[PDB]
């Protein structure tokens, strides 16, 4: 909340990964974990671990004196710029005016001209923050001001704040993407209503304080350079996520579960659920709390199957991402999910299939199920295009669809009972409904298919 207590101070100095975990375990026991304290600690240890080094054992000691000084500087900066008497706080509800005031305080503090600028350590010592860092900084400043209703909101690619009863009020506080006009101060209602992926049709995360702790743990960046990760930061993140997991605080956080699965794939913790179980918990969480309208739970699972060369389950998981995206409209700030679908369609899937082909020269290319999955994937992309502001498919997509269908013999392909929506498979998009017979011809007509995919 506000002000360091002896129950925290007594756990300093933090001389190890396990010392940090112990501080987090104690903070998560309290009704209201201190976001400013935890973010400064993570930012301090990350700052000094994210560098190449000589020396087998190293841990940068977080002395209480340096953490409490940075804490006091943050707390003074915010209390000293925000007079709460000028803001009626009726009913335990912050006003949009107050919320935008705190956001402006943070905003006006940032430098005017990358990695490891996500924490309040970065804010206080270098006045630099990345996009979701700003939003987290606004929530921490509000907690420092006693505004118990201001919370972090997160989609799969953006962050803002919610407040009021049950977080019914929303406010943009940070930037998104590169050249877009500032929306700070506005509600997210337009983004929800335009059906963009960026705002998840309203099925976005609304954090309590413990989920905000989970967010800052997911925000740890172990990357030192393009070829190197800090093993210490990976281990710290993995232990903190298991701590959050055990306390139930990842229950409504699919991306944290996927992150935890990836970490367990990297180095499994003895006695813990295996990565596959964790990926499916993330999917279960998205189905339970978020109407199965998230993309990444299936993208996480697909990547895992891809790495493990389970071609069938990878394709199925990728088709699932497309079955989710088909209900959205592609909008002008949804580029990241476009880039991902693009890469999957025109890079990952072709190479995975090329690797499969090279193997039969010396078996999923013979699975009709696998071909069904590939069709369902492309049908979702086409249906996604329908009703969308900007076009999705283009000639590049066309080149690799035909190349990927070619990896299946007409013998294989002919065993799938394609059905126009009005292994058996039903189509929902006009384009795929269109060229359905073309997908099963013993001779793929490249030009026809290429044409119908690129149609308006």
Ligand X SMILES: N#C/C(=C\c1ccc(O)cc1)C(=O)NCCN1CCOCC1
Name which position in 33, 191, 254, 303 contacts ligand X (CB under 6 A). Answer: 303
What letter does residue 269 receive in the DSSP assignment? P
Cα distances (Å, whole numbers) of residue 175 to 172, 191, 311: 8, 14, 38
The residue written with tokens 């960046």 in the block is: 221
Rank residues 305 and 407 by Cβ distance to ligand X and give the closer one. Answer: 305
Task: Report in angstroms how near the CB of residue 34 gets to ligand X at its nearest.
Answer: 22
Rank residues 159 and 349 by Cβ distance to ligand X and give the closer one. Answer: 159
Specify the stretch interacting with ligand X by CB under 6 A; choose among 51-59, 292-300, 386-394, 400-408.
292-300
Q: Residue 374: in which H helix or E strand, if any?
A: helix 368-385
Indicate if the alpha-carbon torsion angle 268, 263, 206, 287 is positive or negative.
negative
Task: Report in angstroms how near the CB of residue 297 gets to ligand X at its nearest.
Answer: 8
Task: Report in angstroms how near the CB of residue 397 gets to ligand X at its nearest.
Answer: 19
Cα distances (Å, whole numbers) of residue 210 to 241, 303, 397: 12, 28, 42
Q: Which residues contact 112 (CB under 8 A, 6 or more apart)?
A: none
Task: Report in angstroms how near the CB of residue 293 gets to ligand X at its nearest.
Answer: 15
Specify the stretch interacting with ligand X by CB under 6 A; choose among 149-157, 267-275, 325-333, 425-433.
149-157
Name which position in 300, 318, 330, 341 contacts ligand X (CB under 6 A). Answer: 300
Rank residues 99 and 255 by Cβ distance to ligand X and give the closer one. Answer: 255
Residues 280 and 301 sit within 8 Å (Cβ to Cβ): yes
Give the whole-angstrom CA distance, residue 113 versus residue 127. Answer: 10
Q: Residue 106: in which H helix or E strand, if any?
A: helix 96-109
The residue written with tokens 């900007």 in the block is: 390
Tokens of 320: 């699932």
Rank residues 8 and 119 by Cβ distance to ligand X and give the closer one. Answer: 119
N-to-C CA span, the chain: 54
Rank residues 134 and 416 by Cβ distance to ligand X and give the closer one. Answer: 134
User: Hey, which residues between 22 and 41 contact ligand X (CB under 6 A)?
Assistant: none
**Residue 170 touching ligand X (CB under 6 A):** no
Rank residues 78 and 306 by Cβ distance to ligand X and give the closer one. Answer: 306
Cα distances (Å, whole numbers) of residue 239 to 49, 69, 212, 232, 269: 16, 27, 17, 11, 9
Residues 333 and 394 sit within 8 Å (Cβ to Cβ): no
Give the whole-angstrom CA distance, residue 240 versus residue 243. Answer: 5
**Residue 255 touching ligand X (CB under 6 A):** yes
Task: Report in angstroms how near the CB of residue 295 gets to ligand X at its nearest.
Answer: 8
Rank residues 75 and 259 by Cβ distance to ligand X and give the closer one. Answer: 259
Residue 86 sits at φ, ψ, to 5 deg, of -75, 5
Number of residues that bind ligand X (CB under 6 A): 12
Specify the stretch interacting with ligand X by CB under 6 A; choose among 182-190, 237-245, 268-276, 295-303.
295-303
User: Hey, which residues between 117 and 146 contact ligand X (CB under 6 A)?
Assistant: 132
DSSP string, 142-165: HHHTT-TT-EEEE-SS-EEEEESG
* Exposure on the CB side of residue 175, measured as CA atoms within 13 A: 12
Specify the stretch interacting with ligand X by CB under 6 A; choose among 5-13, 65-73, 80-88, 152-160.
152-160
Name which position in 46, 149, 157, 293 contacts ligand X (CB under 6 A). Answer: 157
Rank residues 137 and 439 by Cβ distance to ligand X and give the closer one. Answer: 137
Specify the stretch interacting with ligand X by CB under 6 A; choose among 16-24, 69-77, 96-104, 155-163.
155-163
In the bound state, the residue with its beta carbon closest to ligand X is 299
List interacting residues with ligand X (CB under 6 A). 132, 154, 156-159, 255, 258, 296, 299-300, 303
């Amino acid at each position: 909340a506000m002000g360091l207590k002896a129950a925290q101070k007594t756990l300093f100095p933090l001389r190890s990964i396990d010392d940090v975990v112990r501080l987090f375990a104690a903070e998560l026991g309290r009704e209201e974990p201190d976001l400013v304290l935890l973010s400064l600690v993570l930012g301090f240890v990350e700052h000094f671990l994210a560098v190449n080094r000589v020396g087998l054992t190293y841990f940068p000691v977080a002395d209480l004196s340096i953490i409490a000084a940075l804490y006091a500087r943050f707390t003074a900066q915010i209390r000293g710029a925000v007079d709460l008497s000028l803001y009626p706080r009726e009913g335990g509800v912050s006003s949009r005016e107050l919320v935008k005031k705190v956001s402006d305080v943070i905003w006006n503090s940032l430098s005017r001209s990358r990695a490891h600028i996500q924490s309040l350590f970065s804010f206080i010592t270098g006045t630099k923050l990345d996009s979701s860092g700003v939003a987290f900084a606004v929530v921490g400043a509000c907690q420092a001001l006693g505004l118990r209703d201001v919370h972090l909101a997160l989609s799969e690619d953006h962050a803002w704040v919610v407040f009021g009863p049950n977080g019914e009020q929303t406010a943009e506080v940070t930037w998104h993407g590169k050249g877009n006009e500032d929306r700070r101060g506005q509600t997210v209602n337009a983004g929800v209503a335009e059906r963009s992926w960026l705002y998840l049709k309203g099925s976005y995360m609304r954090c309590d304080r413990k989920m905000e702790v989970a967010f800052m743990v997911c925000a740890i960046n172990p990357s030192i350079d393009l070829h190197t990760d800090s093993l210490e930061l990976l281990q710290l993140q993995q232990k903190l996520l298991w701590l959050l997991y055990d306390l139930g605080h990842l229950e409504r956080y699919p991306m944290a579960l996927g992150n935890l699965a990836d970490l367990e794939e990297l180095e499994p913790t003895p006695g813990r659920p295996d990565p596959l179980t964790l990926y499916h918990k993330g999917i279960a969480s998205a189905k339970t709390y978020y109407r199965d309208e998230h993309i990444y739970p299936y993208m996480y699972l697909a990547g895992y199957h891809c790495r493990n060369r389970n071609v069938r389950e990878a394709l199925q998981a990728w088709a699932d991402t497309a079955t989710v995206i088909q209900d959205y409209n592609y909008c002008r700030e949804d580029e990241e999910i476009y880039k991902e679908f693009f890469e999957v369609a025109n890079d990952v899937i072709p190479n995975l299939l090329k690797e499969a082909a090279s193997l039969l020269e010396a078996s999923a290319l013979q699975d009709p199920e696998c071909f069904a999955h590939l069709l369902r994937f492309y049908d979702g992309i086409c249906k996604w295009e329908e009703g969308s502001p900007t076009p999705v498919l283009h000639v590049g997509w066309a080149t690799f669809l035909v190349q990927s269908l070619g990896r299946f013999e007409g013998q294989v392909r002919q065993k799938v009972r394609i059905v126009s929506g009005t292994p058996v498979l039903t189509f929902q998009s006009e384009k795929m409904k269109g060229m359905k017979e073309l997908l099963v011809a013993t001779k793929i007509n490249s030009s026809a298919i290429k044409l119908q995919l690129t149609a308006q």
